[PDB]
Amino acid sequence: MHLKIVCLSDEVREMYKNHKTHHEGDSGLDLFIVKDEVLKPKSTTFVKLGIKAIALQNIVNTSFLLFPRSSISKTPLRLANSIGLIDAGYRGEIIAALDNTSDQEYHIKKNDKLVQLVSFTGEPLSFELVEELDETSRGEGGFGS
Amino acid sequence: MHLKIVCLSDEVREMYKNHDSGLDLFIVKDEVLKPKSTTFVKLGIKAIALQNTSFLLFPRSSISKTPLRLANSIGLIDAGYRGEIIAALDNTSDQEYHIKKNDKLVQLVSFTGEPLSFELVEE
Amino acid sequence: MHLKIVCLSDEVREMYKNHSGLDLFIVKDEVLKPKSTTFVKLGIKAIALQVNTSFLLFPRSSISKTPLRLANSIGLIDAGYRGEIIAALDNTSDQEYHIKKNDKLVQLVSFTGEPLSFELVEELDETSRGEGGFGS
Numbered sequence A: 001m002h003l004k005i006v007c008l009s010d011e012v013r014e015m016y017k018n019h020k021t022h023h024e025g026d027s028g029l030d031l032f033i034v035k036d037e038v039l040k041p042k043s044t045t046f047v048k049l050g051i052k053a054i055a056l057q058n059i060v061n062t063s064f065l066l067f068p069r070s071s072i073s074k075t076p077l078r079l080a081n082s083i084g085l086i087d088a089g090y091r092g093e094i095i096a097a098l099d100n101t102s103d104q105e106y107h108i109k110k111n112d113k114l115v116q117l118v119s120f121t122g123e124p125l126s127f128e129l130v131e132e133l134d135e136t137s138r139g140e141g142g143f144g145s
Numbered sequence B: 001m002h003l004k005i006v007c008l009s010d011e012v013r014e015m016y017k018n019h020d021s022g023l024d025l026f027i028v029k030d031e032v033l034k035p036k037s038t039t040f041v042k043l044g045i046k047a048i049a050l051q052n053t054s055f056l057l058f059p060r061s062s063i064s065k066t067p068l069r070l071a072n073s074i075g076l077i078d079a080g081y082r083g084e085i086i087a088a089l090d091n092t093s094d095q096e097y098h099i100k101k102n103d104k105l106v107q108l109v110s111f112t113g114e115p116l117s118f119e120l121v122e123e
Numbered sequence C: 001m002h003l004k005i006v007c008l009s010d011e012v013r014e015m016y017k018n019h020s021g022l023d024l025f026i027v028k029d030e031v032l033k034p035k036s037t038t039f040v041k042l043g044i045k046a047i048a049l050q051v052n053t054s055f056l057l058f059p060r061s062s063i064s065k066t067p068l069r070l071a072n073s074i075g076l077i078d079a080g081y082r083g084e085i086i087a088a089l090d091n092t093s094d095q096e097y098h099i100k101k102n103d104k105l106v107q108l109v110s111f112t113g114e115p116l117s118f119e120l121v122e123e124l125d126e127t128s129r130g131e132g133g134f135g136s
């Protein structure tokens, strides 16, 4: 599956240009937290990941999945919607709905990795950074803006 | 991915006559979920899938705004299952939570992630 | 999808010899603390063959009646992986919770959703992590 990713700021583009953390094989592509943020106790926060994305599998545009990373387990953070379903047609900012199950506020930091994108096939993924997803303003393409 | 769905009462029939990767399922009767609880919510339907195949029950994205969570994370509905479809919902709140006929909390989805089609059926 | 499973002790081998989703056993009695996440070791390593493929660890439906929930929602096991399989279990109760040898809380499933088979095998490949090769 091939992901095309629009970074919504230069600071995000800088994090994905220097990705680190993804290799040959890998069924999941880790996404970054892009800004320090405090999640309230006993709350759901809708955390914006600073990117938009489409997946391609003669080419079709496909739905894909947003999984928690394994290592989220050691934190009190849980993915509210279990596994996120990103539809083929979605062009908005990718967002993680994180339940803070603790009674203390929880600090997430720029460069933390809590979730990863995954293909319905389970096959290795690759990605490239792109200026737009399609011609629409929401896809960040087309005349003007 | 094609579903043949059997509705269980006529008023559920009506709901599904009156409707991309997932097919939203309706809450079929008003119900109060106790605080800190897990409730098995019957969805008024049985269903098979043709592509005879297994399929998945995901929470809908919008469940996140509520304090309800699917207890078994993602439901796995085996090719062999003929029973009514049931969502196990935890209410993570200290308060009761009311769910209404027509609420959409849960969706069916195929292992391929390809857009889904259904027909109502009676057997 | 075909799974090749190494049991990490003879006791575990006995359980899998006498056995869509393939259910995995709890292999030792253990007490989960209240309000906790525990990495429960399942005493097996496993590979899925189609060549090697990624696969998924779901909770079983019946986990819903307990207070135990899978902390990472659905586990993703990469094609590589040769480590012991672990279930990350949240005990959402304020009492300790007893799991027992033979309980079934979790299951392996394919990304295809195809029915699966397994055989018990002595090594996954030649490496030590695969339980293979010289010295084993």
Ligand SMILES: O=C(NCCO)[C@H](CCOC(c1ccccc1)(c1ccccc1)c1ccccc1)Cn1ccc(=O)[nH]c1=O
Residues within 6 Å of the ligand: A046, A066, A081, A083, A084, A085, A086, A090, A092, A093, A094, A095, A096, A097, B061, B062, B063, B064, B065
């Ligand atoms: O299609 C969408 N949005 C359209 C723009 O609104 C989805 C997310 C649905 O948006 C949520 C939301 C919508 C309605 C009620 C409650 C929440 C959302 C839900 C769950 C996870 C992530 C996002 C949303 C939209 C905008 C701001 C905050 C939340 C995209 N999506 C789906 C799963 C997901 O995990 N992340 C994500 O971005």
Ligand SMILES: O=C(NCCO)[C@H](CCOC(c1ccccc1)(c1ccccc1)c1ccccc1)Cn1ccc(=O)[nH]c1=O
Residues within 6 Å of the ligand: B040, B057, B072, B074, B075, B076, B077, B081, B083, B084, B085, B086, B087, B088, C061, C062, C063, C064, C065
């Ligand atoms: O085979 C099933 N049901 C009836 C046959 O026994 C499955 C789910 C298992 O049934 C539960 C249950 C079984 C054993 C202990 C506790 C609960 C169940 C669990 C989780 C989700 C939904 C249903 C069940 C069966 C009958 C009444 C209430 C719950 C089908 N299934 C699986 C996932 C799911 O999300 N919904 C569902 O209906």
Ligand SMILES: O=C(NCCO)[C@H](CCOC(c1ccccc1)(c1ccccc1)c1ccccc1)Cn1ccc(=O)[nH]c1=O
Residues within 6 Å of the ligand: A070, A071, A072, A073, A074, C039, C057, C072, C074, C075, C076, C077, C081, C083, C084, C085, C086, C087, C088
């Ligand atoms: O690839 C792994 N381990 C390599 C050794 O690190 C996995 C899970 C990541 O390992 C955990 C862990 C790592 C880092 C921080 C916290 C936990 C883990 C997390 C979630 C579920 C199961 C295991 C781990 C590794 C070693 C001992 C205990 C936990 C394998 N995996 C993935 C999903 C899963 O559900 N079960 C599992 O065994």
